[PDB]
Design a protein around this ligand. Structure first.
Ligand SMILES: CCCCCCCCCCC(=O)OC[C@H](COP(=O)(O)OC[C@H](O)COP(=O)(O)OC[C@@H](COC(=O)CC)OC(=O)CCC)OC(=O)CCCCCCCC
Ligand SMILES: CCCCCCCCCCCCCCCCCC(=O)OC[C@H](COP(=O)(O)OCCN)OC(=O)CCCCCCCCCCCCC
Ligand code: HEC
Ligand code: HEC
Ligand code: HEC
Ligand code: HEC
Ligand code: HEC
Ligand SMILES: COc1c(O)c(C)c(C/C=C(\C)CC/C=C(\C)CC/C=C(/C)CC/C=C(\C)CC/C=C(\C)CCC=C(C)C)c(O)c1OC
Ligand SMILES: COc1c(O)c(C)c(C/C=C(\C)CC/C=C(\C)CC/C=C(\C)CC/C=C(\C)CC/C=C(/C)CCC=C(C)C)c(O)c1OC
Ligand SMILES: CCCCCCCCCCCCCCC(=O)O[C@H](COC(=O)CCCCCCCCCCCC)COP(=O)(O)O
Ligand SMILES: CCCCCCCCCCCCCCC(=O)O[C@H](COC(=O)CCCCCCCCCCCC)COP(=O)(O)O
Ligand SMILES: CCCCCCCCCCCCCCCCCC(=O)O[C@H](COC(=O)CCCCCC)COP(=O)(O)OCCN
Ligand SMILES: CCCCCCCCCCCCCCCCCC(=O)O[C@H](COC(=O)CCCCCC)COP(=O)(O)OCCN
Ligand SMILES: CCCCCCCCCCCCCC(=O)O[C@H](COC(=O)CCCCCCCCCCC)COP(=O)(O)O
Lengths: 93, 385, 248, 126, 54, 385, 93
């Protein structure tokens, strides 16, 4: 097969990261490891941490656009009622 | 060597779904790709087994769909899976493209991957529109009419292009027959574009939610991301089974069970739920030609995205203002859909125009300015002089 | 639009087949067919409902056969090519009262009565809309509404002006089981019958939904366990780093 | 795609002015500690995307010990993001340790590529 | 070791999977049919056939 | 490096049709592969543009084919190209498989390539049969009936398999609709198998008409075999244009212009011209089950071919007796086709049985015995003792 | 990318043939070369050589099977005529 260009991911053995030295791993078999030991206290406190650091960036745009949609929908159902029909007459023309 | 490495066919299966080096920090948002693959297989298999009972004449389309839902054994399962799975296909694809915008997967060296993604998105919108017109309900007929008149807006040529599309003078029997043939055809082009998408992905590997390299700590595909994708596959099938079996006709429009009548126009012509932001973008422009150009520019402005992100760090993970304006953009897209679902009434015209402007301003003004300000803020926060 | 063009919002009636486990009331479907045949079937076709679908659902075998043999359908012609008729059988469809569209528009002041095979699935609101449409005619329209002559008022129709007549009055039919047949009773029965006609799969759809949701919820929890299991070697992995000797 | 000479010019114009520095350096380090890359145990020069040949050059330039330290900080960041936790408060990168260590290597590669492009497109002094 | 020989060979493992899936399909079908009929007693057609005795 | 080598997409185009090292001694028989690719593209494009006007009901199939041939602009070009190109597709495929048997391309290391070729051959026979039944003429209806009753020969299960295939109790509206859906579907499976075929080819390169290695004198694909394939492409289009425009209905059977009548059986039910050897093989066995097993074994006996060729030189080029018995086999295959076109009459039954026996004897007895004798003859011709 | 197995065709540079030495090529540009100079005398004498060495292996099987088909077809149209109807009676039963 033909050669190809320089990529930024190699394969197992020549992956292409920087050379690393003196960094040791430690892992235990999952047969001697108890899974889901960290669901209780975890799904409460870590989930509250993940919500607290991260909710306000979602809650302010939702608040802005929901308030703007609600004000627009309220103004719609105002001016297509009997009370605002002359205003509908002057803004539709 | 091993047989999964030395065989010609199994080497692709190996290097794609067995020994593919994935970054070990990717969360469940890097699972929508496998989920889209599963949902495409669902759409194709239900499409074949439901198109064995479908007759594509204009006088026999709606009756054959009802023949599927009534006389065919388990045919209601097929049609409900098919329509609601197309809805979930666009929902998972929207979440996948939002994963692309958020974590900066569009940036270099993954521009080819992003462009093939945008091509897949355009082909999928085309497939869904053609298959929705194959039902030939009320909404199907009148939506086909409105979209092809939008193609008649093209100057000096357009009327003959539309008489070519229709195969006649209005939406008639040749139109529905060629929409069924094209609708059978284009998903295989989508499958070929998906294979090209996987190639352009595989030449550099996935990103990670930190925006740094992942060449240091790679874990294989097999058993790790196989069972993580199996988790989200079962969740996706659970939610699809809810919206198929317990509430099937929620996402659809009830006018689509009226047969196609060219004489009666509906009270409100609305596409199916996911094409509504694009329909709102087109309806916000007070011109037909500029409306069609703006509707296609609303997808090509995703192609102009890697050239405007001037942030020197990849992805919006560790940046404040870019993350905030990203969620401004997402809820703006939802607001485009909800503007498009409404009528052409005060003040929805003005809000549709402002919402279209904030869409294009996010893709063209907000991202480069906020990325430049965030770069300078990262620099002067830690450099003292 | 105003609320008049959009039509009044049909409320939430507590049907006996809402909810993810409740099925149809088949006695109500039987009585709804009786009210259909004696009231609606003068002016509404039911073109997509075969006779065989009522066998074992709302009527027995001989009841459907002796209701279908009262009608005449087109037989294959005889040995001289003359067109002939035949009595109905189980494989035929429920015939409409009108031979074509123009006879319908002639007999109903121009307005075409829509086929009721899918009418509870082709209107927003559905069951509540059909019930409020039938039981929603005022005795007289509100003050200031000029109806076009030949049309009728009820607020649930989009626009207010409908071309239907109020055709549910007190005790115009008799029930076989002796149920008091008021207007609301008959309207509830025909709305349940039209829900059956649009959705004949409804019973089997909900029980297969029960099976599928149970099996997929169990699979989802089992797959969460196996993902937390096979990733346990990678979640708990630890890294220490003593920086190497700088002479090399 | 910011071309580090440009961001360095803007940042030095902000720092050398007293009014602009007094105005937007508190905004700057407030932005930094709301960004939260410290809490994963990273530095900002560990965070610049390195999949363009000029940054790849500036990583070849780097000394050995800082390269091994950068590799350890990346692997501990991937492991901490994998467990969906944060590093404990004793292991967070402090404000004094967030040194722009890779910036001069990047800037000299910037000046080298800029000079190569200019000399590749010169006229002649006629 | 009491059950591990019941899990040791993969042949007897997948044989257990298929035998249990056969039994599960039969029992689960019968049980969900019985519960779905019991929950809606008085509404199914055999109830109306029993009531209408004419 | 060059852009055709460094790009992800163009590297496949490079390594397959630009810089592929081909042996420089291959003649025009190594051109049928490119010719089959061109003819497959012809079949697919005419199938799409002709299936935009096709309605697959049993009461509307033949009328829609005649609507294509009469009312559609240039529709006679489409149908005549389509049917006569299917005939040329099988003729070029028969010549390609004969090139495979003659020059020994089935031998090691190309057994995977040969097996994927046999899979493509089975899928193509299936596609042609389904599309011939989509016409719903007289021959279409009765051929579908005979082939599915042959599937009813299977013991203890077969009648329910056939009621599953028919979708009813005889060849009716669901049968023709599902044959049209399957017939639209299976050519894309053929395209995927063709891509797998090209992969299994590319891992070892083509053979050569000498049976020796070709690693010494390779010339590129580009301009050399590009223009050689362009020569045979223009010759193929010339002969196809003759049999489309000047004599279109020669290869077809004239009974196929009678509409499908389930009551009238024809005087002679015969498939289209290329399935006749297989029909003769099946008709020669005096049993239904053994007939169906023998008809499928007549294709699986091509899979048992690389294990019986005991010749130590590759290909029949430099061997006398193997070349002679190869042409015995080829003219026997033609004689099978001509026996199958005739009636069940004396002496065509006895000749059909002898011809089937010589078919299986060539694939199972003649090739190993003649190859062993040819090996020993090559040895003792030059070794003296 | 992963490594693959040993094939029998490499690429331009490492094709995998035997090492060769002292074998020189000579080729002329086709712009200074006259094409189709070898069509006349060639399509006569070389085509007759290619026919003479190669026809008889095709002509003997065609002769055998065409003679056998012709004898069978003649015997068919004999015994379904008036002359051989009693022979058709005795060989069809
Ligand atoms: C039936 C529908 C099929 C539709 C497919 C359309 C394509 C038909 C393909 C037929 C074929 O491929 O046979 C190839 C066969 C072997 O070729 P070879 O390499 O050994 O000969 C080298 C040539 O002199 C080089 O000479 P050169 O390469 O310079 O030109 C070749 C010739 C092109 O002709 C062909 O491709 C085949 C007709 O140019 C001419 O001069 C033509 C003059 C009018 O050519 C021959 O030489 C004939 C030998 C007998 C074959 C009889 C075939 C009966 C089935
Ligand atoms: C189920 C499995 C499928 C089986 C398919 C059955 C066969 C399908 C029929 C297709 C026809 C293909 C004919 C055979 C194609 C290969 C022939 C060939 O390779 O030609 C070359 C051959 C010998 O040439 P050399 O390569 O040996 O020359 C070296 C010089 N020293 O040159 C020759 O010997 C002359 C070649 C002349 C070809 C004659 C073809 C006859 C076609 C049938 C005619 C029917 C009417 C009677
Ligand atoms: C035959 C192959 C086939 C394929 C492949 C296919 N569909 Fe469809 N699809 C159909 C048919 C037939 C219909 C019309 C029958 C129906 O709507 O139930 C249809 C209808 C639809 C509808 C309208 C459903 C409704 O009832 O309103 C949508 C939406 C749709 N397809 C989307 C898709 C998408 C998205 C894909 C794949 C990316 C896809 N289809 C692939 C056959 C197919
Ligand atoms: C829609 C895509 C389509 C594809 C792809 C396609 N066909 Fe067909 N084909 C048709 C249609 C439609 C018909 C029936 C109309 C006709 O026969 O003209 C047909 C008919 C045929 C017929 C019968 C022609 C006749 O009139 O007797 C044959 C033979 C055939 N196809 C073979 C093939 C082969 C071989 C291939 C590819 C390997 C193929 N087709 C691919 C659409 C297709
Ligand atoms: C236009 C955007 C876009 C669309 C549309 C798109 N993709 Fe992707 N896809 C991406 C990007 C970007 C990535 C790379 C993810 C990243 O940034 O690391 C990707 C990656 C993937 C992956 C690898 C797994 C993963 O999550 O990254 C798969 C699988 C995939 N895509 C499949 C699909 C399929 C299937 C479709 C539709 C059929 C599709 N994609 C449509 C942009 C897209
Ligand atoms: C007087 C003749 C007549 C009778 C009797 C009649 N209908 Fe109608 N019905 C109509 C006409 C006409 C329309 C459509 C009028 C229109 O569109 O304005 C209609 C429309 C309807 C509609 C839908 C109206 C809409 O706006 O969508 C329903 C539901 C309906 N009928 C139910 C019934 C039922 C149930 C019965 C019997 C119980 C019945 N009708 C008996 C004439 C009749
Ligand atoms: C049953 C046998 C067989 C069938 C059928 C077959 N192939 Fe081949 N194909 C081969 C073999 C064997 C080779 C290589 C022979 C050699 O090089 O000596 C080959 C080679 C090729 C080549 C390379 C050029 C050449 O002539 O060697 C192409 C291209 C090709 N096939 C395409 C196709 C296509 C397209 C089809 C139909 C869709 C097809 N093949 C059907 C066996 C087959
Ligand atoms: C980055 O890491 C990766 C990664 O590298 C990969 C590869 C994947 C995996 C990607 C996929 C699985 C997507 C692949 C999708 C395709 C290849 C699309 C192909 C789809 C098809 C439907 C194939 C077409 C097949 C058919 C149409 C056959 C159907 C035929 C039928 C049903 C015939 C029925 C008729 C009869 C008579 C039975 C990942 O998910 C992933 O993230 C973890
Ligand atoms: C060994 O060396 C090689 C070699 O490597 C290769 C690749 C080839 C080439 C072989 C092939 C290309 C065969 C492969 C064939 C395919 C992959 C088939 C592909 C065809 C399709 C997928 C169908 C085509 C589909 C389209 C063109 C889509 C567009 C069609 C329509 C109808 C859209 C029109 C609609 C509108 C609205 C205009 C050789 O010939 C060859 O020998 C020299
Ligand atoms: C083409 C369609 C794409 C859909 C995307 C689907 C992505 C997830 C695929 C999951 C495949 C699981 C195989 C794991 C495996 O074989 O591990 C095998 C054995 O594992 C198992 O037995 C898993 C139990 C059986 C699970 C069956 C799941 C079937 C439901 C699939 C629903 C989607 C089709 C190897 O496991 P080991 O290496 O840890 O020993
Ligand atoms: C997918 C379908 C497969 C069909 C198999 C077709 C195999 C032959 C393909 C021929 C392509 C020719 C390109 C040569 C080329 O570009 O050389 C280019 C320029 O050559 C030419 O200009 C050729 C003149 C134009 C010929 C146009 C032929 C079109 C008819 C094609 C009919 C079949 C589709 C490079 O030539 P050079 O490297 O010698 O300089
Ligand atoms: C556009 C691309 C579409 C997708 C195509 C690429 C992805 C293909 C994935 C295919 C996965 C399944 C293939 C596994 C089959 C492996 C068997 C094998 O390779 O053994 C092959 C023989 O294969 C065959 O005979 C027919 C295989 C046809 C496959 C039909 C699906 C022998 O291969 P090999 O030469 O390495 O063995 C030497 C013995 N020690
Ligand atoms: C039927 C196909 C089945 C699957 C087989 C795959 C083979 C596909 C053959 C396609 C050949 C023609 C493709 C030419 C495209 C080359 C252009 C290109 O690579 O430029 C790419 C960009 O590509 C695109 O944006 C659009 C590609 C869409 C292609 C849709 C057809 C340049 O990217 P580059 O390689 O220089 O990487 C630098 C990273 N910034
Ligand atoms: C071919 C792709 C199809 C994927 C479907 C996924 C969508 C989920 C809804 C499925 C409902 C349709 C089936 C059904 O109605 O069954 C119902 C039972 O529900 C289930 O068991 C569905 C569980 C889905 C598990 C998926 C396993 C993966 C198989 C891959 C293909 C071999 C009806 O059961 P029954 O007919 O009574 O035997």
């Amino acid at each position: 097969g033909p050669p190809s260009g320089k990529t930024y991911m190699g394969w197992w053995g020549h992956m292409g990261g920087p050379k690393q030295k003196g960094i040791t791993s430690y892992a235990v078999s999952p047969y001697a490891q108890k899974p889901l030991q960290g669901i209780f206290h975890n799904a409460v406190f870590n989930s509250f941490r993940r919500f607290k650091s991260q909710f306000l960036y979602v809650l302010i745009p939702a608040g802005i656009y929901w308030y703007w949609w609600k004000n627009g929908n309220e103004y719609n159902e105002f001016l297509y009622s009997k009370a605002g029909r002359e205003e509908l007459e002057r803004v539709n023309v | 060597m091993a047989f999964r490495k030395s065989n010609v066919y199994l080497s692709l299966v190996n290097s794609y779904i067995i020994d593919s080096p994935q970054p070990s920090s990717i969360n469940y948002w890097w699972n929508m790709g496998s989920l889209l693959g599963l949902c495409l297989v669902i759409q194709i298999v239900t499409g074949i087994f439901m198109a064995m009972h479908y007759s594509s004449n204009i006088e026999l389309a709606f009756s054959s769909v009802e023949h599927i839902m009534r006389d065919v054994h388990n045919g209601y399962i097929l049609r409900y899976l098919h329509a609601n799975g197309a809805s979930f296909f666009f929902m998972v694809m929207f979440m996948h493209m939002a994963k692309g915008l958020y974590y900066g997967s569009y940036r270099s060296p993954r521009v080819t991957l992003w462009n093939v993604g945008v091509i897949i998105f355009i082909l999928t919108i085309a497939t869904a529109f053609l298959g929705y017109c194959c039902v030939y309900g009320q909404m199907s007929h009148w939506g086909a009419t409105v979209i092809t008149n939008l193609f008649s807006a093209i100057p000096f040529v357009g009327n003959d292009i539309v008489s070519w599309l229709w195969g006649g003078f209005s939406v008639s029997n040749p139109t529905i027959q060629r929409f069924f043939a094209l609708h059978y055809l284009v998903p295989f082009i989508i499958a070929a574009m998906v294979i090209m998408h996987l190639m352009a992905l595989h030449i550099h590997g996935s990103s990670n939610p930190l925006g740094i390299t992942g060449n240091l700590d790679r874990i294989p595909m097999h058993s790790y991301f196989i069972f993580k994708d199996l988790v989200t596959v079962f969740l996706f099938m659970l939610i699809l089974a809810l919206f198929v079996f317990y509430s099937p006709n929620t996402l659809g429009h009830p006018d689509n069970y009226i047969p196609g009548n060219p004489l009666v126009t509906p009270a409100s012509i609305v596409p199916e739920w996911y094409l509504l932001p694009f329909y709102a973008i087109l309806r916000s422009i007070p011109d037909k030609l500029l409306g069609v150009i703006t509707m296609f520019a609303a997808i090509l402005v995703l192609l102009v995205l890697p050239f405007t992100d001037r942030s020197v760090v990849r992805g919006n993970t560790f940046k404040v203002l870019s993350k905030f304006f990203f969620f401004i953009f997402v809820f703006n897209f939802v607001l485009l859909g909800q503007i498009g679902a409404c009528h052409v009434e005060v003040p929805y015209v003005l809000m549709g125009q402002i919402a279209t402007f904030i869409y294009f301003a996010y893709f063209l003004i907000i991202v480069p300015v906020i990325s430049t300000i965030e770069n300078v803020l990262f620099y002067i926060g830690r450099v003292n002089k | 639009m105003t609320a008049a063009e959009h039509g009044l919002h049909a409320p939430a009636y507590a049907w006996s087949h809402n909810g993810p486990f409740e099925t149809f009331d088949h006695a109500s479907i039987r009585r709804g067919y009786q009210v259909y045949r004696e009231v609606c079937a003068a002016c509404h076709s039911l073109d997509r409902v075969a006779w065989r679908t009522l066998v074992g659902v709302s009527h027995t075998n001989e009841e459907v056969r002796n209701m279908a043999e009262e009608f005449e359908y087109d037989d294959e012609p005889d040995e001289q090519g003359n067109p002939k008729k035949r009595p109905g059988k189980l494989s035929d469809y429920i015939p409409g009262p009108y031979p074509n569209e123009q006879a319908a528009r002639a007999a109903n002041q121009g307005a075409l009565p829509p086929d009721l095979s899918l009418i509870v699935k082709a209107r927003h609101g559905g069951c509540d809309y059909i019930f409020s449409l039938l039981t929603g005619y005022p005795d007289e329209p509100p003050a200031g509404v000029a109806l076009p002559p030949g049309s009728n008022y009820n607020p649930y129709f989009p626009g207010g002006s409908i071309a239907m007549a109020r055709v549910l009055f007190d005790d115009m039919v008799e029930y076989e089981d002796g149920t008091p047949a008021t207007t609301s009773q008959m309207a509830k029965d025909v709305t349940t019958f039209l829900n059956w006609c649009a959705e004949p799969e409804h019973d089997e759809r909900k029980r297969l939904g029960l099976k599928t949701v149970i099996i997929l919820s169990s699979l989802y929890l089992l797959s969460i366990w196996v993902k937390k299991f096979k990733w346990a070697g990678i979640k708990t992995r630890k890294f220490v780093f003593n920086p190497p000797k700088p002479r090399k | 795609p910011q071309s580090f000479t440009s961001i360095a010019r803007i940042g030095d114009y902000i720092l050398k002015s007293p009014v602009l520095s007094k105005l937007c350096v508190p905004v700057a380090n407030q932005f930094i500690n709301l960004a939260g890359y410290k809490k994963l145990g990273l530095k900002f020069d560990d965070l610049i995307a390195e999949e363009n040949p000029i940054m790849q050059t500036a990583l070849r330039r780097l000394p050995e010990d800082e390269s091994y330290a950068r590799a350890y900080r990346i692997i501990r960041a991937h492991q901490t993001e994998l467990t969906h936790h944060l590093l404990p408060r004793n292991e967070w990168i402090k404000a004094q340790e967030d040194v722009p260590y890779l910036l001069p290597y990047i800037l000299e590669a910037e000046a080298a590529a800029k000079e190569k492009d200019e000399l590749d497109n010169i006229e002649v002094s006629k | 070791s009491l059950y591990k020989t019941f899990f040791k060979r993969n042949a007897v493992f997948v044989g257990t999977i298929f035998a249990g899936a056969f039994v599960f399909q039969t029992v689960f079908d019968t049980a969900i049919t019985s519960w779905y009929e019991n929950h809606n007693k008085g509404k199914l057609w055999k109830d109306v056939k029993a009531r209408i005795a004419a």
